[PDB]
């Protein structure tokens, strides 16, 4: 009786008889997490060792002790992006309030499928997304939806555009004569190809446009590509403008692209998954000029807003387009004026991600977020200043965000020797000061990429890193030759 087979703390009994055991277990977990996270800076950003002993469920439930030991062992070997010496990827330190809100949401166990399941979260999400859309420059007719990652947002926007221009919602793409074409920058994200493939358009449907030296779209090249594809059998219907590309973090000229698309009557989609956070900065918001011309926007607050994963949204200039092109009246649930979020979304059941974003915005505030963005820009400006004044160092392009991609180009060394030199420098930096630099391959060459997101990285760290770089250059065998 009273569930004697289950462990005394398997569930939180609604009556509340086992409150003491639940409290003790929660306290143990909280203490372990606090101890692990407090000493993040001491541990190296990356660990080479990995664990591979899983996939054997026990017949008898293991006690809380032992489980805690295994959890601690797993945690020690996990990736460590919380240390200040991790400036290689877009992952950064998340706000504490967001993590606590995520825990609260998991404990509540509500659902975003319908309003009945989320009486308050649905309205909160609607209002918060409306405020964000207003901040991007849209009117009251604009409307958005939250998804799990920017890939789903891109897929939803492309599907809506395809349905609106071709009206294949109920028939399909088999009867169409000319293949639709989507034009994208040659430095665009890899999710565009997957989205095009999943919609039946074809992986080869995406047509790449040339970019200038700063990894920005070339408007004349875009016009030439549009004309060349029109003369052929295919017909263009969408143009994708990327703000904050993946590698160099550059921003396309959205204003000219929007003008061209309006001239040719194409659907303009803006992918500001990283650059969107600029709308929270008074000084640097103008870098996104013309974003109000796009027919849809993809935004990821989890990147530059320090919100625990995952938080991502897609915004549309017109709500009726989402209500008609995407929505299907097949479901016959209870009639309610409020539109269920599962009908106009790619996925039906979704975890309530609005709470963490709302809590983060309330706790930090607008001014603090503006200050954080300004500090990141200051760090990137100092990094760029240090990169110059060194003949052997060259920049891929002038930065537009807190991302800087640079490389070493010894005069005597050739391309392969330069790549080996860059890889050796990355390894040396990682092993000496525990500073992590990503090593992407752009334009056929390896570049050391640094994303400056950690608020605790000081200028002295950058100066010490560059001093170590100079020491490595002087001590390397190439200089002797």
Ligand X SMILES: Cc1ncc(COP(=O)(O)O)c(C=O)c1O
Binding site for pyridoxal 5'-phosphate: what residues are annotated?
Answer: 150-151, 189, 300, 349
Q: What angle do CA 365, 368, 369 make, to 5 degrees?
A: 85
Does residue 300 bind ligand X (CB under 6 A)? yes
Query: How remote is the C-alpha of 229 from its chain's centroid?
Result: 32
Which residue is closest to ligand X by CB?
A: 150
- Please identify, using beta-carbon distances, which residue of 117 and 207 lies nearer to ligand X: 117
Instruction: Give the closest residue to 435 by CA, choosing from 383, 385, 397.
Output: 383
- Please identify, using beta-carbon distances, which residue of 134 and 224 lies nearer to its own copies: 134
**266 close to 180: Cβ distance less than 8 angstroms:** no
- Element (DSSP H or E) covering residue 457: none
DSSP 405: E
Does residue 440 bind ligand X (CB under 6 A)? no
Does residue 142 bind ligand X (CB under 6 A)? no
- Please identify, using beta-carbon distances, which residue of 373 and 393 lies nearer to ligand X: 373
- How would you class 384 by CB atoms within 10 Å of its CB: exposed for 0-12, middle for 13-18, buried for 19 or more? middle
Options 167, 324, 349, 475; binder of ligand X; rule CB under 6 A: 349
Does residue 348 bind ligand X (CB under 6 A)? yes
Options 138, 267, 274, 306; binder of ligand X; rule CB under 6 A: 274
| Least Å from the CB of residue 99 to ligand X | 18
| Least Å from the CB of residue 91 to its own copies | 6
How far apart CA 28 and CA 21 sit, in angstroms, is 11
Encoded tokens for 415: 């391309």
DSSP secondary structure string, 169-222?
SSS-SSS-SSPEEEEEETT--THHHHHHHHTTS-GGGEEEE-B-TTS-B-HHHH
DSSP 93: P
| Least Å from the CB of residue 126 to its own copies | 8
Chain position carrying tokens 């990169």: 387
| Contacts (CB under 6 A) with ligand X, residues 206-265 | 242, 244-246
246 binds, among ligand X, its own copies, none (CB under 5 to 8 A by kind): ligand X
Q: Which stretch binds ligand X (CB under 6 A): 126-134, 147-155, 259-267, 387-395?
A: 147-155
Options 159, 184, 312, 344; binder of ligand X; rule CB under 6 A: 312
- Please identify, using beta-carbon distances, which residue of 182 and 393 lies nearer to its own copies: 182
How far apart CA 38 and CA 82 sit, in angstroms, is 10
358 binds, among its own copies, ligand X, none (CB under 5 to 8 A by kind): its own copies
Which residues of this chain interact with ligand X, rule CB under 6 A?
Answer: 113, 149-151, 189, 191, 242, 244-246, 271, 273-274, 300, 312, 348-349
């Amino acid at each position: 009786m009273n569930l004697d087979f289950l462990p005394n703390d398997a569930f939180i009994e609604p009556s509340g008889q086992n409150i003491n055991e639940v409290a003790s277990l929660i306290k143990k977990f909280m203490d372990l997490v606090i101890e692990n996270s407090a000493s993040s800076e001491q541990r190296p950003p990356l660990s080479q060792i990995e664990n591979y002993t899983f996939g054997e469920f026990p017949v008898q439930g293991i006690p809380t002790e032992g489980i805690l030991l295994q959890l601690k062992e797993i945690l020690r070997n996990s990736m460590n992006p919380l240390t200040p010496n991790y400036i290689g990827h877009m992952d950064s330190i998340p706000t504490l309030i967001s993590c606590l809100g995520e825990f609260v949401t998991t404990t509540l166990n509500n659902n975003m499928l319908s309003l009945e399941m989320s009486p308050v979260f649905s309205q909160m999400e609607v209002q918060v997304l409306r405020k964000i859309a207003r901040m991007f420059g849209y009117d009251e007719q604009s409307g958005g939806v939250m998804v799990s990652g920017g890939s789903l947002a891109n897929l939803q926007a492309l599907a809506v555009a395809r349905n609106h221009y071709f009206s294949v919602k109920e028939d399909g793409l088999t009867g169409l004569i000319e293949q639709p074409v989507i034009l994208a920058s040659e430095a665009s994200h890899t999710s565009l190809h997957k989205a095009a493939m999943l919609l039946g358009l074809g992986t080869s449907s995406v047509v790449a446009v040339k970019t200038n030296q700063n990894s920005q779209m070339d408007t004349s090249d875009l016009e030439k590509k549009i004309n060349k594809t029109i003369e052929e059998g295919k017909q263009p219907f969408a143009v994708v403008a990327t703000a904050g590309t993946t590698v160099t973090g550059n921003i396309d000229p959205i204003l000219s692209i929007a003008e061209i698309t309006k001239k040719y009557g194409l659907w303009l989609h803006v992918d500001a998954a990283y650059g969107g956070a600029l709308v929270f900065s008074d000084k640097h918001r103008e870098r996104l000029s013309g974003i109000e011309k796009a027919d849809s926007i993809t935004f990821n607050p989890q990147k530059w807003m320090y919100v625990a994963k995952t938080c991502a949204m897609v915004l549309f200039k017109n709500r009726d387009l989402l209500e008609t092109e995407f929505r299907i009246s097949a479901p016959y649930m209870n009639d309610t004026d409020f539109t269920n979020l599962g009908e106009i979304s790619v996925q039906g059941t979704r975890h309530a991600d609005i709470l963490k974003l709302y809590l983060s915005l309330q706790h930090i505030g607008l001014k603090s977020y503006d200050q954080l963005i300004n500090e990141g820009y200051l760090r990137v400006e100092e990094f760029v200043k240090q990169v110059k004044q060194r003949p052997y160092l060259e920049l891929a392009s002038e930065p537009d965000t807190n991302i800087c991609c640079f490389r070493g180009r010894p005069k005597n060394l050739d391309e392969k020797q330069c790549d080996q030199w860059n890889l050796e420098l990355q390894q040396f930096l990682l092993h000496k000061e525990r500073v992590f630099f990503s090593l992407p391959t752009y334009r056929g060459k390896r570049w050391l990429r640094a994303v400056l997101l950690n608020p605790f990285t000081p200028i002295s760290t950058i100066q010490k890193i560059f001093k170590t770089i100079d020491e490595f250059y002087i001590n390397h065998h190439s200089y002797n030759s």
